[PDB]
């Protein structure tokens, strides 16, 4: 019983807070605006059954934009390997990762 | 050198509380056709030092029935929240310049009630229980207009920044467009700060001392100096809201002297109201802030929303 009054009577009651790609106040972009736009424009009108298997790649990019799971896993790997090489004395950090580097602008 | 700024904030606003005790007793005395203290120091100028030394060399008396943890935590939280509501106040520069300093003032007003409230609960006494639930009945009465009045006055400011409120009142005082809000805010701050005619928590005649009736000297000092820090902060806040003064960016001491003497006049006004009125019954308190101030406060909220739109005078949020 999804009585779609909002498309029947043409009113916009809650379609605006629905996604991050909608009209935002002062044109403020979300951090995953391009990823969600690509996932929605990919899977528009093809149905959920085809959308779960044909737009899997854009949905994986968008979900990894949101929670940043692969990024933080990669940063765990990099930071942990750095800590191991510091503890073993097999690496010294560069002077721009310590402070004395005359930062850009 | 910020810790020195914190100390030079919070130690003079303990000395101001100390000499507010003397100013209270002497202005209260001369309004009662008598004198205040003039024996202890030269015209009483050393009476608060005697009171401050006396309360910390007297036996503290934690009671037998008192839930001791909340009993000790209540004056600590009292004096902590009394000190920390001075930090967004622009003097012309605040200690901590908050973008939402007004909501900080309001939320730390709402947390300061639990000092009175847990003191009345923890000190397991019947008069303390009456004084605590009369603080409940007082706070549910004043908080239902303390935010709408303070909302309607900042619709001419543009934000909740207290430092912007100096720029807002650079031409005219904000009591001229909002004197019903001002005269209602003043009573809401009387009822906020447990001062007469709205004492109602440390009721001398109904109760014995209300919430702090079990608190002997030492812990009693940190409710009393907390209450006086609340009234000086509240008159400084009322002055910033409605009587904001001239600010020269190259001469800040002119603004400092100006809001100092204005907040001193409003402090004397609190002492002069406490010296002149009978005390409300604490339901007539509630039938005032709900039945009288709240309808008119909603009406003035409608008016102060629509009027910057009506005249194209919506203030900037930046």
């Amino acid at each position: 019983p999804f009585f779609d009054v909002q498309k029947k009577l043409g009113v916009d009651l809650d379609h605006w807070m629905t996604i991050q790609s909608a009209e935002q106040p002062h044109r403020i972009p979300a951090r995953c605006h391009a990823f969600e736009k690509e996932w929605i424009e990919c899977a528009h009108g093809i149905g959920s059954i085809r959308a779960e298997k044909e737009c899997k790649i854009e949905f994986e990019d968008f979900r990894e934009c949101l929670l940043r799971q692969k990024t933080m896993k990669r940063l765990n790997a990099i930071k942990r390997q750095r800590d191991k090489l510091i503890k073993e004395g097999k690496y010294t950090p560069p002077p721009h990762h310590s402070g004395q580097e005359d930062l850009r602008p | 050198m910020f810790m020195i700024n914190v100390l030079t904030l919070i130690i003079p606003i303990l000395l101001a509380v100390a000499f507010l005790t003397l100013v209270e007793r002497k202005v209260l005395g001369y309004m009662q056709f008598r004198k205040g203290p003039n024996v202890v120091g030269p015209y009483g100028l050393l009476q608060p030092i005697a009171d401050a030394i006396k309360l910390f060399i007297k036996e503290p008396l934690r009671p037998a029935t008192s839930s001791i943890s909340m009993f000790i935590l209540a004056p600590i939280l009292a004096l902590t929240l009394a000190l920390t509501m001075w930090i967004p106040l622009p003097m012309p520069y605040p200690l901590i310049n908050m973008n939402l300093g007004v909501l900080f003032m309001l939320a730390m007003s709402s947390l300061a009630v639990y000092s009175i409230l847990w003191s009345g609960w923890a000190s397991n006494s019947k008069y303390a229980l009456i004084g605590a639930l009369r603080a409940v009945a007082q706070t549910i009465s004043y908080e239902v207009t303390l935010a709408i009045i303070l909302l309607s006055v900042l619709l001419m400011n543009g934000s909740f920044t207290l430092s912007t409120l100096i720029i807002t009142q650079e031409q005219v005082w904000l009591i001229f467009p909002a004197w019903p809000l001002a005269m209602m805010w003043f009573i809401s701050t009387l009822a906020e700060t447990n001062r007469a005619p709205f004492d109602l928590t440390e009721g001398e005649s109904e109760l014995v001392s209300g919430f702090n009736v079990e608190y002997a000297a030492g812990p009693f000092a940190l409710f009393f100096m907390a209450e006086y820090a609340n009234i000086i902060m509240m008159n400084i806040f009322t002055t910033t809201l409605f009587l904001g003064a001239f600010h020269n960016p190259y001469m800040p001491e002119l603004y400092t002297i100006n809001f100092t003497i204005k907040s001193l006049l409003l402090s004397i006004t609190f002492l002069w109201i406490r010296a002149s009125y009978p005390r409300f019954r604490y339901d007539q308190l509630m039938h005032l802030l709900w039945k009288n101030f709240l309808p008119l406060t909603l009406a003035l909220c409608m008016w102060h929303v629509s009027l910057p739109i009506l005249l194209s005078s919506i203030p900037p949020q930046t």
Partner: protein, 96 residues
């Protein structure tokens, strides 16, 4: 009086915003070179740290796209001191 002064304040806000807008291209170009500088400095030290590790692929994007993704806070300041981190990631909130 508040009508006159709030209209003047709105005009002064517009003047400040146009000063901001006129500065914004230089700030955006410096911010682009800033983040590309820090990402290249992190990548040129990702090869040294990730050298003994088998199966690693330096500079491997975690996305299947080739579009530019905005650098995250841990992507830029991940290999740097806690002074630079706490200045860059809680600095505006903790400031006064």
């Amino acid at each position: 009086s508040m009508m006159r002064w709030n209209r003047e304040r709105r005009r002064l806000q517009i003047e400040d915003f146009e000063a901001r807008i006129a500065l914004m291209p230089l700030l955006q170009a410096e911010k682009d070179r800033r983040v590309l500088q820090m990402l290249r400095e992190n990548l040129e030290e990702e090869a040294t740290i990730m050298k003994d590790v088998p199966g690693w692929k330096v500079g491997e994007s975690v996305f299947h796209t080739t579009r530019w993704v905005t650098p995250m806070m841990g992507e830029l300041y991940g290999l740097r001191t806690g002074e630079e981190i706490l200045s860059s990631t809680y600095g505006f909130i903790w400031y006064t």
